[PDB]
């Protein structure tokens, strides 16, 4: 089980080269998205019954 | 409301549940048995065996599971044979919840032989492991085990060669078929934890046409008999 | 006085109502006893129901009135109620039994043959046994001595009828079902019957609990039957062929009466409120 | 050989750059937000019509239509505003545990123990559902299947690989290769593109679907990860697993954000999908409930009780509008 060694570490060696942003960025741009399309989410506000599709016609 | 779109799609809806109860119905008048066991077990013999003369009541090859259909003394079964499904049992164990019994299939004759994989690992200790692996599950804990013991002949001829103490060491008794064949059937079945919910039926697979198959209806009947017999409070 | 007697029949009413509609309730919103025998046991309920709503309120007025206060047609009406809606319950419990015996008896029926439509074709048969005892005598088989009395509800004397009525409403069912639970029991041994000593003394353990428990549950169940239905019953066929030396006192007929009565009450208890099932979907519900 | 040494040094200059990028917790960049608060959903429909656990379910794009599979070996296509049954695929095989819906709207496949994921063509001339293609090649049971497109599919099966197939040839284009466990759950990238996939090795795998390796490897969870979906945004994906944890990776944070776990739950999670803007994450239990979840602080926000047996599948609509739950009582359940 040799020839799978050198594949795994390529694999690893791949990984370890790919660039990465910091978590406050990361978190700030989740909250960023969630904000921005919070008006547009059905299940978080709850929708009148006159457009509700499962409600009323 | 009122629109024909609308009536056509509820008169569509109906007609399709109309289909679906029925194929319900006929899918419920059959006997659903699950076969396991080990590599080289003999579950191609019993399979085998149980396809003779009655079968069947651009697709491609499953190789996953293969289902076997046949029809004794106006019973219809349907036996899942998972051999072909090299991953974790724990995934898909509990699809095969709700079958009427399960067929463990155990040669004897690898009681001597021992697995590829290393060699301190003996065939029947890994059977042996299976069967209580798939004995106490959370979803088998009320399905009854049909327990075929298979290659009798060449286990005897092995015992006559090779003594059982390589396999069982703290076996102790004379080295003939009876006593040996005995002593394994109570090792496979003192594995079942579940004694007052699910009963283990052995048979000694042979070779005649109909007696396996015998085996197996006679076992169903009465798992069923006994499933009635505890719903009515009798059991 | 008469207000002990008043609440303890509305209790009694009042529980055999909510017991049979609990019953008929959880059949209908639960999705796991949508089978033939908790159709049987369903179709048994809504007989003990209308037992209850129909009958039952009748007799307790009369009872608590001592007099009919309701005229001769409703007492007639009253009359045809009680056998038709009793019959059907005792002929619910044979078709219950007979059900039973056919799915412990013939696995291959259980499996192919068993569908809904027999559950379905029992309770007519049920129903119609009760309509072929409870019509007939509106229609003939009348002495005047029935209306004689404006003041009383009392069924026909007549030996013919009272000979038919009492042995297709209670005998024929009785000896039906004890032939079936009879077979049952032979049937639960044979399959009950069917260190290596430890092994074999829990085997044997199993094996005698399993014996206590069926004759524990055919018990109850011919047990209840028996001192619900039988002791009015001998009395419903010995009075009618004795005209004198047997004079029936008001208490014990009104309490073999209401033992008749109580077996509507005590059935959804003896047939649903034991199994595990229903006691599963009740707590579900709650 | 000695290549393990290097190996476990690659390892842990990898976590000490993850830990490196982590300089505050998603929790203290979100405190200020104030909480989405107790959230009311009841059930609005309830499609009936199967006769064993249901495995998968998956909606439209139209967000109207949605197919389901269950072990009686049905395929049906619903209509959740009517609850119309439009469709009914008989099955070859009734061991399905897992559905897809085209994107298009024009094929619906569906794959289980059988290694075969087989492809229906819903939209015909005779108006008869037929089955269009069966891909074989998998060596273990297919555990999920998305449409990459009308034309492409990507697969998941228990023989620790992904593949994409060819619907038009039938052959694998690509297989991905890298996880050591079965794989059991698939969610693709919005700009379809990407796809993440958990497996029972514990860990999730980022896949390039036209390059065909192994991007990048989350290993947060402590048992087998049973579910996968990404962020609507695309850059980050919840995982489900058996140790009752719902874990936040984040794509180009290459680690996890958030840990979505309760004391009173002990039970895994089957399925997990985002709502329409990603604040709320559904998640289905093995104790016939859905938590639904504040993404961004780890509170329960509701639970959709409801089901009996175990929710075992679950997803929202494109539109947002309504969350479908089937489970193994037989029922769908649409809760909006
Ligand atoms: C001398 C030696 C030995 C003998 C001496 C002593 C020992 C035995 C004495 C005789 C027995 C009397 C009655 C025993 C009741 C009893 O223990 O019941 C058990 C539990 O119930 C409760 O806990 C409570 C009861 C149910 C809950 C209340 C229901 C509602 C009542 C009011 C209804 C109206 C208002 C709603 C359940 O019953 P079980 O465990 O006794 O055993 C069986 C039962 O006998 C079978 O009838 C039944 O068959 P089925 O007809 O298909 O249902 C079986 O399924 C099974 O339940
Ligand atoms: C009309 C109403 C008022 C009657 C109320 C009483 C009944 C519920 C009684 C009458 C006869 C009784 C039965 C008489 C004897 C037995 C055997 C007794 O012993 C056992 O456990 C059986 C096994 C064994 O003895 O080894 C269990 C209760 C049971 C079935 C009894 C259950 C309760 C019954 C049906
Ligand atoms: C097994 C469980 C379900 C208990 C069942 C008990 C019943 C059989 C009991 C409960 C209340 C009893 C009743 C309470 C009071 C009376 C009034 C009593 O009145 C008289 O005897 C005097 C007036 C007359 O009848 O002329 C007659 C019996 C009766 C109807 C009783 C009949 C038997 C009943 C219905
Ligand atoms: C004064 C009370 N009355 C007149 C209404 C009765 O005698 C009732 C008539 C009955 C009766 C007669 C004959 C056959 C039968 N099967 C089932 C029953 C039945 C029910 C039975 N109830 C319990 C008492």
Known sequence: SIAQARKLVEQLKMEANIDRIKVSKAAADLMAYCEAHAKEDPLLTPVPASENPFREK | TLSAEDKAAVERSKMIDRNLREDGEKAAR?????????????????????????????????????????????????????????????????????????????????????????????????????????????????????????????????????????????????????????????????????????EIYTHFTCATDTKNVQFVFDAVTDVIIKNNLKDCGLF | YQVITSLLLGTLIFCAVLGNACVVAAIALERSLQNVANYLIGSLAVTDLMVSVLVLPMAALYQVLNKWTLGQVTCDLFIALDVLCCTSSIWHLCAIALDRYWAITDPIDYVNKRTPRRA?????????????????????????????????????????????????????????????????????????????ERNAEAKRKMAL????????????????????????????????????????????????????YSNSLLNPVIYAYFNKDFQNAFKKII | DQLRQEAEQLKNQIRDARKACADATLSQITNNIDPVGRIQMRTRRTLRGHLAKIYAMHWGTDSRLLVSASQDGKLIIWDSYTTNKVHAIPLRSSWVMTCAYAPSGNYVACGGLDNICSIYNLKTREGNVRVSRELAGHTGYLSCCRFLDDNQIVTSSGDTTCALWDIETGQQTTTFT???????????????????????????????????????????HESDINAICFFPNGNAFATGSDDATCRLFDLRADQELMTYSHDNI????????????????????????????????????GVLAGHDNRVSCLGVTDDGMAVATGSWDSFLKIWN
């Open chain 2, 30 to 198: 059959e006997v659903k048995l699950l076969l396991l066991g080990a590599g080289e077990s003999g579950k191609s013999t019993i399979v085998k065996q149980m396809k003779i003369i009655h079968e069947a009541g651009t697709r491609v090859k499953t190789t996953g599971i293969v289902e076997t259909h046949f029809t004794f003394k106006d019973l219809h079964f349907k036996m899942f044979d998972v051999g072909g499904q090299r991953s974790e049992r724990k995934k898909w164990i509990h699809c095969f919840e709700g079958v009427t019994a399960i067929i463990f299939c155990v040669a004897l004759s690898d009681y001597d032989l021992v697995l590829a994989e290393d060699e301190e690992m003996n065939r029947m200790h890994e059977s042996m492991k299976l069967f209580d692996s798939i004995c106490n599950n959370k979803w088998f804990t009320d399905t009854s085990i049909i327990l075929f013991l298979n290659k009798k002949d060449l286990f005897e001829e092995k015992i006559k060669k090779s003594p059982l103490t390589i396999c069982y060491p703290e076996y102790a008794g004379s080295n003939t078929y009876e006593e040996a064949a005995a002593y394994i059937q109570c090792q496979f079945e003192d594995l079942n934890k579940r004694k007052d919910t699910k």
């Open chain 3, 120 to 196: 379905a074709a029992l309770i007519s048969l049920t129903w119609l046994i009760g309509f072929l005892i409870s019509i007939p005598p509106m229609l003939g088989w009348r002495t005047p001595e029935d209306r004689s009395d404006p003041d009383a509800c009392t069924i026909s004397k007549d030996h013919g009828y009272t000979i038919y009525s009492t042995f297709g409403a209670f005998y024929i069912p009785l000896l039906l079902m004890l032939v079936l639970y009879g077979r049952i029991f032979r049937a639960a041994r044979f399959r009950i019957r069917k260190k290596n």
């Open chain 3, 209 to 260: 609990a399993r014996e206590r428990k069926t004759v524990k549950t055919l018990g109850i169940i011919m047990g209840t039957f028996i001192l619900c239905w039988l002791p009015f019953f001998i009395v419903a066929l010995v009075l009618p062929f004795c005209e004198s030396s047997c004079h029936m006192p008001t208490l014990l007929g009104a309490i073999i009466n209401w033992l008749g």
């Open chain 4, 178 to 220: 890298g996880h050591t466990g079965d794989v059991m759950s698939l969610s693709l990238a919005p700009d379809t593109r990407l796809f993440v996939s958990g497996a029972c090795d514990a860990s999730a795998k980022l896949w390039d679907v036209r390059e065909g390796m192994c991007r990048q490897t989350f290993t947060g």
């Open chain 4, 266 to 301: 002990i039970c895994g999670i089957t399925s997990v999908s985002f709502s329409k803007s990603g604040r709320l994450l559904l998640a289905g239990y093995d104790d016939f409930n859905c938590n639904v979840w504040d993404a961004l602080k780890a509170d329960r926000a």
